[PDB]
């Protein structure tokens, strides 16, 4: 299936009492698998099967890293800041990462928000930044003069990542690699009078992925319909739903890693 | 363990070529570095490459090839002043650089 | 862009001695290697930036301070023999990911004798 690594940085200025200047965490599709905090300055595992494969040396060496990657942060921040003349708490965020899809083929992402909205975004494909405004457009242009760091990014982002992403994969295979399939009912009632409303209830899956739709007659997809959001169950499982009203045969349609699922409603 | 290989010595002829070889074998790859380094003197950038290709600056030219684990460092046009250490350096997976032993090059007038 | 001291140095065995290195380029990773015959670079300790240091390959023997962005000094607490080498200091931009090149000091030759 399609998997993916990334990394998050989370730069806030002038923060409250109980705000972490900085943190980075770390995921393997929905699981974290490390973080870090300018309070705690210390790199630690999120996930079991990433304590057990990774020794003591590797933790250190990554915590040296990422105290240097906290402070160059506080800089950019900085930075930004003074080119919008902004005063006051503001934010500054990096996403870094890699997907493997099911085809074989790759994805890879870098990108940069300021006060959470898009700021700058890599593109490994052209070697080019993509800047939002004026201020952007500034520290674009710095970057795209530095030939070589533009290349190592591409570097990083089509082979690094990517065997560092199969290694955790291997890792955490019992996890990551499972199936849960779900389980799935629909229920009918009459609400307004008049009314019927159709939910096709979804739970106890694992991957979270799952495809879920409503059909008529068997051919056609049901124009309004209301989708749950894909929700944490809170045990590694995962849960979900689709709504619509009814007014001939109407189905659920359900697809979960590879398997197919209708329920008829009689 | 990781490994990163160039020659003890190399000897070549003034107004020839010569190419000095760096096969390094790591568990993964962020970039390779030249460095010269005349006798009794510090070590100073010549190079980078991290995609495959040649990348030529001046009588200097660099190449890599990911596949093979390998890069040259091309010195065109040799002259006396050429006469150095060349020092190859490989950052692995975990950024960090392992250094070759160096290359001393020497030129026959 | 890289001062260190000093050039040249004769201790003896059991003494202690501290090598300094300054840089005035506003980089934040700086690296104590040595050099011996034979042998490619082997980093002693780094300072991916001010305010933190590791050991790298070979720090039994020594410590370092990384005193402030500018100065990482190095120190031999007892010296020893095997402690006779070239030693260099160098900085970049940043470390761990990036193409920066280092920026080596003029190289400090220390020599240990009984």
């Known amino acids: 299936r399609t998997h993916s690594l990334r990394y998050f940085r989370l730069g806030v200025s002038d923060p409250i009492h109980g705000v972490p200047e900085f943190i980075s965490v770390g995921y393997v599709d929905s699981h974290p698998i490390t973080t870090y905090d300018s309070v705690t300055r210390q790199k630690e595992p999120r996930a079991p099967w990433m304590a057990e494969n990774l020794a003591p040396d590797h933790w250190e060496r990554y915590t040296q890293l990422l105290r240097g990657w906290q402070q160059m942060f506080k800089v950019e921040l900085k930075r930004l800041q003074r080119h919008y003349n902004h005063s006051g708490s503001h934010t500054y965020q990096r996403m870094i990462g890699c997907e493997l899809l099911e085809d074989g083929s790759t994805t890879g992402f870098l990108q940069y928000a300021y006060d959470g909205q898009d700021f700058l975004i890599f593109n490994k494909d052209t070697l080019s930044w993509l800047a939002v405004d004026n201020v952007a457009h500034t520290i674009k242009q710095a970057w795209e003069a530095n030939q070589h760091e533009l290349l190592y990014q591409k570097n990083w982002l089509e082979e690094e990542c990517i065997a560092w992403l199969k290694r955790f994969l291997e890792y955490g295979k019992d996890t990551l690699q499972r199936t849960e399939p779900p389980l799935v009912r629909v229920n009918r009632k009459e609400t307004f009078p008049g009314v019927t409303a159709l939910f096709c209830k979804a739970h106890g899956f694992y991957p979270p992925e799952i495809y879920m739709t409503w059909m008529k007659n068997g051919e056609e997809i049901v124009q309004e319909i209301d989708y749950g959001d894909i929700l944490p169950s809170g045990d590694g499982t995962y849960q979900a739903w689709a709504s619509i009203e009814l007014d001939n045969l109407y189905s659920c349609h359900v697809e979960h890693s590879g398997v197919h699922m209708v329920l008829q409603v009689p | 363990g990781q490994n990163i290989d160039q020659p003890t010595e190399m000897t070549a002829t003034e107004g020839a070529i010569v190419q000095i070889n760096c096969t390094y074998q790591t568990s993964g790859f962020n970039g390779l570095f030249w460095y010269q380094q005349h006798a009794g003197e510090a070590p100073t950038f010549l190079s980078y490459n991290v995609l495959d290709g040649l990348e030529e600056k001046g009588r200097f030219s660099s190449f890599l090839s990911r596949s093979k684990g390998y890069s040259y460092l091309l010195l065109k046009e040799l002259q006396m002043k050429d006469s150095a250490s060349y020092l190859c350096?490989?950052?692995?997976?975990?950024?960090?650089?392992?250094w070759g032993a160096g290359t001393k090059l020497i030129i026959k007038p | 862009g890289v001062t260190q001291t000093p050039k040249f140095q004769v201790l003896k065995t059991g003494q202690s001695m501290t090598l300094q290195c300054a840089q005035d380029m506003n980089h934040n990773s700086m690296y104590w290697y040595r050099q011996d015959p034979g042998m490619g670079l082997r980093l002693i300790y780094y300072?991916?930036?001010?305010?933190?240091?590791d050991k790298g390959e070979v720090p039994n023997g020594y410590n370092v301070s990384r005193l402030n962005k500018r100065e990482f000094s190095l120190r031999l607490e007892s010296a020893a023999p095997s402690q006779t080498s070239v030693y260099f200091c160098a900085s970049s931009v940043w470390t761990g990911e990036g193409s920066g090149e280092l920026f080596f000091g003029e190289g400090s030759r220390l020599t240990v004798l009984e």
């Open positions: 300072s991916a930036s001010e305010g933190t240091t």
């Open positions: 350096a490989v950052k692995d997976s975990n950024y960090q650089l392992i």
